[PDB]
């Protein structure tokens, strides 16, 4: 009661600071820019050759090479230029949650509901692909193992706990904690000195990875947070809500500048991605149909179609000159 | 055109890729996978005799192969983990029948996992434990069903009957009351697209990878049979 | 922005009625299906009572059924819980707490001492 009180005073403070300083809205002010325009999105090629349904993806560095997996317990490296089975590893748990592509494409890391997104090689000098790192240490599920370089992972678990890893020990350097519920995507800033969880109790921390301390929070939703994309200028990030909602929020502002929803739509989002001009916003469904949203005026664009099932992943290439899908019919789409 | 001769390459590898893809297709098929769920402590890992994400199981049934998943290794979360579970063939669900006060909980559990929308097509098996034990303890009587559930007031056995030698009308009574519960919260809401298949089972029984192949074996059929929109 | 409060409560003697009400804030309240729990000393948490979007449909525990009302006032956002003809035995501290998923009917609520969409609690005792 001596504390409580006071820590409803600093929340009362903190919202009227949000609130003051707030002179117009987003909506407001850029309501004078004509609007994008219809677009013709459509597939200019499909993968297949999966085995059960997909749940992540990742594109490589060069934008031609992308590494994806499957409840099937497999990781599959496409081309996409000619789509061509460049490898095939399959983890030792048929279980996987998560992929990621090292910058330098000498290394990916995948996890699942065992606790250990393991080190994958790809550069073997004998000739043979092996596994080289399994961490362990985390307690629950890995819902992110992204990579940072050769030698550094950063990874965010189910049991509230995220930290960064050194490959070469494989043993944390620095945990990350203070989210109260389950964190399930994070993503990093262009200039890779800070990064962004979103949890399951309708928050999203940043934070600072040379000194692992908390450095803002953001709360504009009403229920978890399913997938995080930063902005390409680092000034923004935009996050997948479970309640049909995407909302975007503003660091130096520190509060929520414009959020996108409909009466059309009553789903709940699950992955979503920045184009790199970044006035297109990809957002995810779980009604098998992905929409895209005018970035700087709340409106739609066209929503794409044509995938089977629920949709588990998604992505933008490192130049923006395509964009892949994954979703649980085993398939993988890219589009123009 | 040289450069096509690492396209040649490229094209040896996407043969060997899917070669060795065919076979895995082949087997991922033919395994059968069950999905393992009760509360701590409730004869989970005794289940089955099991001569033959953490905690799986092989074991073939006269020329049949099974994969039994038990995750239990995360916390009391589950609105997230158990979405990753779609299309899993049956779950089996085993609940410790003598707690008389968790036995609630275990009741919410089921309803919940019935009406979760990613779940609302797959049917579960159910097995009962410790028969023996609540047959001790009614037989003792110094507690009584009376004391937590009221609808023990004014139950009266099935006509369906089907007791065992020993089995009194007590512990009869008690038995399918229970199983009674779990029926209507099955058939509260079930659409045609699933069901639930009650059992009853002690800790040192044998039969259960039977019931479990004749369970699954049923399911299939009533699946098949859907697909022919009878 | 997610605030849960937890009026009502306190001492009265055995079978003295009683009121409660979970007035949330920050989130579209009629979206969501509403739950009460409770955790007596030397125990753990445990589902009591709840309520579907529109009122329409209630469910309760074996041991209260006939002794609570569950009632859900939509556009006031506050939810209340008569309390009658209490027993020695029911004392413990009580929460309101709003399962995650609006437009369903499948709830986990009732996580040890992890939940997040939790009220922040009340107490309510009895004594002769």
């Known amino acids: 009661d001596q504390l409580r009180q006071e820590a409803e005073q600093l929340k009362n403070q903190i919202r009227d600071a949000r609130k003051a300083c707030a002179d117009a809205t987003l909506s407001q002010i850029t309501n004078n820019i004509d609007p994008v325009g219809r677009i013709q999105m459509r597939t200019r090629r499909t993968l297949r050759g999966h085995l059960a349904k997909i749940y992540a993806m990742h594109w490589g560095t060069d934008s031609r090479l992308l590494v994806s997996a499957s409840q099937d317990g497999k990781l599959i490296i496409w081309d996409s230029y000619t789509t061509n089975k460049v490898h095939a590893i399959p983890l030792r748990s048929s279980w996987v949650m998560t992929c990621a592509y090292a910058p330098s494409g000498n290394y990916v890391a995948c996890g699942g509901l065992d606790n250990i997104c393991s080190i994958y090689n790809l550069k073997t000098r004998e000739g043979n692909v092996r596994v080289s790192r399994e961490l362990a240490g985390h307690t629950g599920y890995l819902s992110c193992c992204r990579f940072l370089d050769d030698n550094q992972i950063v990874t965010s678990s189910g049991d509230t706990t995220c930290a960064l890893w050194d490959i070469e020990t494989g043993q944390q350097t620095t945990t990350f904690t203070g989210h109260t519920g389950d964190v399930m995507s994070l993503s990093l800033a262009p200039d890779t000195r800070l990064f962004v969880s979103g949890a399951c109790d309708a928050s999203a921390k940043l934070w600072d990875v040379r000194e692992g301390m908390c450095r803002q929070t953001f709360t504009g939703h009403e229920s978890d947070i399913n997938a995080i994309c930063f902005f390409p200028n680092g000034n923004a990030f935009a996050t997948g809500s479970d309640d049909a909602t995407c909302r975007l929020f503003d660091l130096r502002a520190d509060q929520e500048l414009m959020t996108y929803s409909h009466d059309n739509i009553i789903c709940g989002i699950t992955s979503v991605s920045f184009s790199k001009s970044g006035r297109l916003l990809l957002a995810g469904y779980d009604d098998f149909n992905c929409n895209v949203w005018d970035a700087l005026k709340a409106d739609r664009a066209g929503v794409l179609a044509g995938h089977d099932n629920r949709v588990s992943c998604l992505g933008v290439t490192d130049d923006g000159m395509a964009v892949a899908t994954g979703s649980w019919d085993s398939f993988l789409k890219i589009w123009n | 055109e040289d450069q096509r001769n690492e396209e040649k390459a490229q094209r040896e590898a996407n043969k060997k890729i899917e070669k060795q893809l065919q076979k895995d297709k082949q087997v991922y098929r033919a395994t059968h996978r069950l999905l393992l769920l009760g509360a701590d402590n409730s004869g989970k890992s005794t289940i089955v005799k099991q001569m033959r994400g953490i905690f799986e199981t092989k074991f073939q049934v006269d020329k049949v192969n099974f994969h039994m998943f038990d995750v239990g290794g995360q916390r009391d979360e589950r609105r997230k983990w158990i979405q990753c579970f779609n299309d899993v063939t049956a779950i089996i669900f085993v609940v410790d029948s003598s707690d008389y006060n968790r036995l609630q909980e275990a009741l919410n559990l089921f309803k919940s996992i019935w009406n979760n929308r990613w779940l609302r097509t797959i049917s579960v098996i159910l097995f009962l434990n410790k028969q023996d034990l609540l047959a001790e303890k009614v037989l003792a009587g110094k507690s009584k069903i009376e004391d937590y559930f009221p609808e023990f007031a004014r139950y009266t056995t099935p006509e369906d009957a089907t007791p065992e030698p020993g089995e009194d009308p007590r512990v009869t009574r008690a038995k399918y009351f229970i199983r009674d519960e779990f029926l209507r919260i099955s058939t509260a809401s079930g659409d045609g697209r699933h069901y639930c298949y009650p059992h009853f089972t002690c800790a040192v029984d044998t039969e259960n990878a039977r019931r479990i192949f004749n369970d699954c074996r049923d399911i299939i059929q009533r699946m098949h049979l859907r697909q022919y929109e009878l | 922005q997610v605030q849960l409060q937890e009026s009502g409560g306190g001492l009265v003697q055995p079978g003295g009625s009683l009121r409660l009400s979970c007035a949330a804030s920050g989130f579209t309240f009629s979206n969501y299906k509403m739950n009460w729990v409770r955790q007596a000393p030397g125990k753990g948490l445990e589902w009591v009572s709840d309520?579907?979007?529109?009122?329409?449909?209630?469910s309760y525990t074996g041991s209260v059924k006939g002794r609570f009302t569950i009632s859900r006032d939509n556009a006031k956002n506050t939810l209340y819980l008569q309390m009658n003809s209490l027993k020695p035995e029911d004392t413990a501290v009580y929460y309101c707490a709003r399962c995650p998923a609006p437009f369903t009917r499948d709830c986990f609520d009732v996580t040890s001492t992890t939940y997040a969409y939790r009220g922040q609690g009340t107490q309510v005792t009895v004594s002769s």
């Open positions: 309520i579907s979007q529109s009122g329409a449909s209630i």
